[PDB]
Amino acid sequence: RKTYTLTDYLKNTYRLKLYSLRWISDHEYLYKQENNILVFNAEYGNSSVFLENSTFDEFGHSINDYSISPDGQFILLEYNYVKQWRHSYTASYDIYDLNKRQLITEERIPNNTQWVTWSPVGHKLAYVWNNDIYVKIEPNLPSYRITWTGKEDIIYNGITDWVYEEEVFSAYSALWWSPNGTFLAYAQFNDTEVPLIEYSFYSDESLQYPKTVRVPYPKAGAVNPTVKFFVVNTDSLSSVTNATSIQITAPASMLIGDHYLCDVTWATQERISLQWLRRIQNYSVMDICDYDESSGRWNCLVARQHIEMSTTGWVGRFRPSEPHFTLDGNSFYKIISNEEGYRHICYFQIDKKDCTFITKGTWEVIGIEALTSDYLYYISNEYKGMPGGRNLYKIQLSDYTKVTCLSCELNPERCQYYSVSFSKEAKYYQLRCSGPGLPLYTLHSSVNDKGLRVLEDNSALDKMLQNVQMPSKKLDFIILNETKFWYQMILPPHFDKSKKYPLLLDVYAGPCSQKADTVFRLNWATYLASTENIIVASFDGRGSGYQGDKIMHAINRRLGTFEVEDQIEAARQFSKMGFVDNKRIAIWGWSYGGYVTSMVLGSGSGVFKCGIAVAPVSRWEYYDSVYTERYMGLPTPEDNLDHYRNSTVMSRAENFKQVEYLLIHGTADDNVHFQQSAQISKALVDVGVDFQAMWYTDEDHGIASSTAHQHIYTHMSHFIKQCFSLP
Amino acid sequence: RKTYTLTDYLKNTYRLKLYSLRWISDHEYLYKQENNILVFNAEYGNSSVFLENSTFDEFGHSINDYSISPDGQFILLEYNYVKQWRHSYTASYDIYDLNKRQLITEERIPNNTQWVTWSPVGHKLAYVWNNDIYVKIEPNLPSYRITWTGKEDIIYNGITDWVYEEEVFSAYSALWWSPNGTFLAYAQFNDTEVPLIEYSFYSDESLQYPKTVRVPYPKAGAVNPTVKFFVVNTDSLSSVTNATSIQITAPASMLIGDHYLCDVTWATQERISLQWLRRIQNYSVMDICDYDESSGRWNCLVARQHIEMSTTGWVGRFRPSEPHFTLDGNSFYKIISNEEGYRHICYFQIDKKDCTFITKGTWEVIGIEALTSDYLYYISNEYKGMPGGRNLYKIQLSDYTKVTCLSCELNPERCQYYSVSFSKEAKYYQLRCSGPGLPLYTLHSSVNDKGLRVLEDNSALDKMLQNVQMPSKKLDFIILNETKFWYQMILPPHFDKSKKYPLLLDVYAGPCSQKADTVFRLNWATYLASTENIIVASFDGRGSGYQGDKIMHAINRRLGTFEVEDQIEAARQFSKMGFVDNKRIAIWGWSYGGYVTSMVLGSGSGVFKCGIAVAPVSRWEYYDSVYTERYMGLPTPEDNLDHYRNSTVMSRAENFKQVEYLLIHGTADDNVHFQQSAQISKALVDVGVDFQAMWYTDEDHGIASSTAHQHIYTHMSHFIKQCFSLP
């Protein structure tokens, strides 16, 4: 008789259990038993206590994370965790000897270390501190400082700056050990002329003057960071002479203009692959660099370059694909568009231009997961032609026809969204099942692909959910101009298709987005349907991903058009399904969704009663360069300034008179700047439109403070309930 | 059958006519006939066109203001007006010869001039440009640069910095010509170590990166600006040698610590009076400085110092009073507290300590308006014991008993709030009547005080107002602990004391405030009562002015206490009048009112349903030093840190759960910093209270943009209507 209330979502009353493990060897992994770390065996499921809780009672500090050295002799300890941006943070580090069972108290890793990583084998150590790189050959010995040029907010050695972190690497780190730990490949970023975004930080009430944050941040068309790439030989590091770092220069075609280092991948011990991208993100080059013994330098033969380019839009889904090399390093696999525009696996041969495709069809390969000498293991959405499903497939390297599905039939009813975790030589794999049923976690041996045991089945959650009226989940498609376009609906408990429901359209709709999937979730929508009887829906229209280029490249150079209209058209289709009170239709989104939400409410379609935009982009000139220019080119008279000018929400301010509007922005948002919503709010005030604002002091782009998270969703629920006349 | 709507207020449908004039001689003034400037005669009411409109058709620029040189030979023209803060601005200037009828095109006054003023007689000219002072002896000759030290945001010569402008002088200028124009007294402000307030400015949508504003601004207890004072002799300015500026140093008792220059007044050609104030604003000294012919220097005899100090709080209403000297400069008059704590006129004698009072009683002299050799003319609120009335009184200098009221009886029904404008030798005076009836403007001759003619009677407005259902206005008092405490009520049309009305408490309630007066007004309240039938009320409680020190010094060192409780108690009194729906009582205020509004809503009294705080101070440590410390002393363990800590709105965040709350702040407010509302909004989010926010992009402290002014009042009306359940 009870429903999924707001407080159930805001308090995690029903918690989804994960099974988070990490492979140590090829048959041994680790797990956290609330307080204990064990070494589980991949053969038997027997575990012995690897690390007890009372091991670091005496430490004094709270331990954020840990890290085992590859040989299993040392453990790196992380504490005083201070977050920066999406991936970046700062921590104090301690090394603990596992065999001697004691803290290394000499030559300790400094406070405020930006990044640390063990070498792939043994126990070498590379850390970045004040933007410079240091290498430790032994945990208790001095560290050789490899770089000297590192300067705050200007020169980044072995770590990324803002825009590379967010948009290019999805990591703070910019270091790459060679396979056996001999070479340390690193990148360097010059931000000298990159402009600063500035904003207040009001901080604790005890701070009398607001602080001002200043981040090097290239908005669309402004001066970008510049990048150099280096490889240093750690084995011949000297106490007496500074370590010499060999530079691999960008190729001819990339130097002629602004460019990006967008991918670094080691092939073998003496082989490394670089992928450069042009600022105009439709032309990329892949250099393959070998080590010359006599020279001591790296040489990339021109005849080994490979061009990944695209006539119909940007290259890659968000960045070009990474390569997966055979062991001998004379051959690799990656995911490119085929001639009909669908992303599949091409078998490349080191020395030739033409590659041959190993998979094909009207569906896309999502990722390459591991390759052995016998098999290539990949995930795709081929199963039942469902773009929103994920399944694991193995392909035989001796016969491209022999392709087995390893996950499709395991549990076809409860399980359709899979992800994988292979052991250190791909002997075993963990399968995470994400929906539509409750998450399921299993372990298998890839020799015969048979199941071994259930790691987590969420039966503890299952039992509790029977006591609650849960909403149901409809994934389906519709036909627009002869193409399938998928949508999902979170349908209220005891759903009655003859009754008339209020509908909340939940929008993201960015380039290569996908809001219609088979993933079980417990979010606000769950509550909205369950307690408030509102049908929340999502619809992947033009420019959404995993369906080929034709659909994804549709919005090329035309952001804020087709995908906006497609959202309006989606609601129009939903109200023509006849179970929708077309007088009470609302739209809401975050980030890009925030934007679409605003462009739709400002469209004048008349379809939408009200809507909420959280942290919206308002015009593209205000957003970071790499993301924007990827889809928009440059805001110049010679490029695309016209459609930059022509696609802002400020320009649509008049039509907002027709709707009710809640705009929310975190004041300390470094990603989508407060500036964006401030420029919207102004435009509306100017043309006399009334709306609702909520700023969030010192909240950033996630508004994910413990307390702000609660408050923002409470605030929105009140807004939505009232706009739908629900008491 | 029609009422005063919202659009009548937001569009000025019913406009109050002023009569704005400026005396040129002792019997000739100027007026603006929409497009024309005339010279009206004070004897006959005959006017000849002084300046035609088509005189500056050819100018090309729009002319913001004008200014006549005292002799009537030159007119100064103001254009390209760019506003800075409350009084400060920046303009291009042109001088036009009135007799030759042409623009002076040589040695023109520079663009971005910060301030200009004619010398009291003749046609000398002093201007401030890039923080340095320049003097022009003739409109077409080079200017002598008096100062060389002026530096942006640091050194201010002859103009004020932020805090002096806002809190001390109420002017941008810091120049004072001597009576006949020989000496130019100026002030200098050092801001070297004054900290900066920083904030974004989002500007036009065409600005890609928000700008950051940086103003030297001393918050409570921080480092203040320092000040020096100079007198330069303009008659002996040289082309060849730099002009020498004689410094008058602050007295011994002022130098021992932090202090202010708070008043500069010339007594005679060779006599000047300075009033210094301690940072602890209860001790002030007045130095009187005389010119030494042989020296060429200024000497202020110690035996001519006068101390104005206060045992029970701060000295003066907002600053110490200014002196009004007899012609010979051996005697002056000013407004100080008498021994029973009410402000009256003391007759000071240059060479002695003790002054004798010329007026007395339980009421207060408001201002001294002009003195002749025969009469002192002042405004007070004595009439009918009404603190909220203003009337003109003349007092005989030969007999302190003979005091005539010049305005009381003129029109006792329509007119109770008077202000005055005397001619250049006090031969004639203009009376502005401000209420309770329609504003009335009359002219009189002070020789026999008889009326001469009606200048403006607003009959044009009167005619229109008969067609509209107007609200009525009740001024009255109540008795709390044996003291009278006044309140006013804007009562809805056709008011029915047996019916039950919704009440909006309109609060300011700052030190020396007065919201209960006899002034006719057309504001939001008019509409609220007229169209929405809401009783809006105001109540001057403890800490309010014009009633003696006992009432005003009540909140000394105790801001955010008595005056807050007294607002709650006021509502409690109003609901005990029985025409009030005590289920629908709301509070709202701006600035200090914003604060009290928020302190009341956070009180937990239960009396108030909802309320709106616009640009509120949230804790006193965040507000400028001179204002704060005046009432609060220093936020230090040895002074008053405890009550700084104990009187914040953030600390009352929990109780806001009981009320509904709209917080509004302009993001580019340099006065009450956004920081303040941002710290409130945080406090609430943290304790889980829901509220409403509205930020105002680039709006400052007045939120007085044409468009924002409309938008904010619309938004608030919606909030108030809905909180009162009015459709």
Ligand SMILES: CS(=O)(=O)n1c(-c2ccc(Cl)cc2Cl)c(CN)c2ccccc21
């Ligand atoms: C949550 S997001 O889809 O909006 N998102 C966005 C994103 C995309 C577009 C816009 Cl307008 C805003 C954001 Cl936060 C980025 C930046 N590329 C990202 C990176 C890593 C993970 C998620 C990310």
Ligand SMILES: CS(=O)(=O)n1c(-c2ccc(Cl)cc2Cl)c(CN)c2ccccc21
């Ligand atoms: C409009 S105000 O009463 O709030 N006000 C305030 C004021 C007083 C207190 C607070 Cl918390 C805020 C303001 Cl704007 C000042 C600053 N002393 C002022 C100067 C000249 C004219 C009006 C002024």
